[PDB]
Amino acid sequence: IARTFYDGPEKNYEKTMAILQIEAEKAELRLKELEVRRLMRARGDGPWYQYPTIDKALIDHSPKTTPDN
Amino acid sequence: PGIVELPTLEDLKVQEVKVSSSVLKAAAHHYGAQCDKPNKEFMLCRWEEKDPRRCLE
Ligand SMILES: CCCCCCCCCCCCCCCCC[C@@H](O)O[C@H](CO[C@H](O)CCCCCCCCCCCCCCC)COP(=O)(O)OCC[N+](C)(C)C
């Protein structure tokens, strides 16, 4: 029965280790992502949460019929 | 925040051109033809400094 239908314990052992490593990495990544999101929303210095500002290319840098603009 | 620096009254004293608008308009073309260099210097100062206090002379 063991030869025909089942395998050794080493296979399940090492598969369990691989699964545990994947899940632990995923958990640490989720926590890190939450912290990064909080920091980016608080500060705004990162790529995320970059709300638009007025484009400076719309400014007209020409004499304005009045020296004091 | 800060103190605005203003010229003294003696710095704003000059001989005034006290002819009316009709005299000025009658003379305007020749006046622009002849007195152009100081006028353009003053206008360049005016449009480059953006400050009346820096173009009194
Ligand atoms: C000498 C023996 C004397 C005593 C007899 C004891 C009787 C025991 C037989 C009863 C078997 C119970 C069913 C349990 C089947 C386990 C299914 C599965 O777990 O096994 C698969 C193995 O496949 C097997 O071939 C399963 C075949 C059994 C199919 C059962 C069907 C029986 C129904 C018969 C009904 C009658 C039909 C006629 C209708 C009129 C696993 O696939 P695989 O990942 O690859 O193999 C991994 C292990 N290896 C790598 C070491 C090989």
Between CA B20 and CA B12 the distance in angstroms is 21
The residue among A61, A65, A66, A68 with the most chain B CBs within 10 A of its CB, best to mutate, is A68
Cβ-based neighbours of B27, under 8 Å, separated by 6 or more: B19
Residue A39 near residue A46 (C-beta atoms within 8 A): yes
Residue with tokens 């691989």: A18
Helix (H, G, I), strand (E, B), or coil: what is residue A47? coil
Helix, strand, coil percentages (3-state) for chain B, rounded to 5, are 60, 0, 40
Resolution of the experimental model, in Å, one decimal: 2.9
A6 Cα nearest atom in ligand 1? 48
Residue B13 near residue B56 (C-beta atoms within 8 A): no
Residue A4: HSE in the Cβ half-sphere, 13 Å Cα cutoff: 1
- Pocket perturbation via mutation, ligand 1, pick of A5, A10, A15 by most ligand atoms within 8 A of CB: A5
Between CA A17 and CA A21 the distance in angstroms is 6
Positive or negative: CA dihedral B22, B23, B24, B26: positive
Q: Outline where B1-57 has alpha helix (H).
A: 21-34, 36-49
